[PDB]
Write a protein that binds this ligand. Structure first.
Ligand SMILES: [Ca+2]
Ligand SMILES: [Ca+2]
Ligand SMILES: [Ca+2]
Lengths: 142, 72
């Protein structure tokens, strides 16, 4: 199929579909979805497609975000038990729940997280309250 | 790490759930086998060769029961 049924380099992918790697050409919508389709995965980049996204029904968009994080999540994750968006806007919404105890670290915005998620490499609470004021001990030898 | 945008999202969020490793590993094996199923769905969808759309229901219900089965 790939080793010898065709000329390797005699001619390109046909103009019916769009080139994206020398080993792969891509049909249409697939260049914009975030899937590893082009086989170097560079579909949603360069300059051709998807600087932005938009959400359908039963989905919500993390507006305050950049391409490195996320820009659309389903309702299956809004006001759930775990933050999803870049700034964790999904858990605030109109919910704004009360209950939080000494068993979890308390953020400025009101949300709470486990104590282990304080002073680390991750933006856990969205507000970055879990990171502000921390004093990181130095790294290991390795 | 995984091909479809949604499977990577499920994989980070499954790690955010701190699920047991044996349950978490079984998630990928069900999603990675679905990865090969969704590729042939997506080929026959954009090419329109799936005239009856048989490959969509069997991936949608599988994903739904995956979400219910593994505690998501
Ligand atoms: Ca893609
Ligand atoms: Ca959430
Ligand atoms: Ca943190």
């Amino acid at each position: 199929d790939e080793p010898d049924t065709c000329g390797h380099s005699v001619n390109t992918c046909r103009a019916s579909q769009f080139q994206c790697d020398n080993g792969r050409c891509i049909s249409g919508n697939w260049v914009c979805d975030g899937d590893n389709d082009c086989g170097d995965m560079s579909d949603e980049d360069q300059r051709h497609h998807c600087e932005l996204q938009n959400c359908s029904s039963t989905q919500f968009t993390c507006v305050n975000s950049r391409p490195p994080n996320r820009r659309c999540i389903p309702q299956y994750w809004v006001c759930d038990g775990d933050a999803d968006c870049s700034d964790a806007l999904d858990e605030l919404q109109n919910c704004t729940m009360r209950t939080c105890s000494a068993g979890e670290f308390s953020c400025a915005n009101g949300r709470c997280v486990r104590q282990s998620f304080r002073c680390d490499r991750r933006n856990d609470c969205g507000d970055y309250s879990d990171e502000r004021g921390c004093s990181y001990p130095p790294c290991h030898a390795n | 790490e995984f091909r479809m945008e949604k499977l990577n999202q499920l994989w980070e969020k499954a790690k955010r759930l701190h699920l047991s490793p044996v349950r978490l590993a079984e998630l990928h094996s069900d999603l990675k086998i679905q990865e090969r199923d969704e590729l042939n769905w997506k080929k026959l969808k954009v090419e329109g060769l799936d005239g009856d759309g048989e490959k969509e229901a069997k991936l949608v219900h599988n994903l739904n029961v995956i979400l219910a089965r593994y505690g998501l």
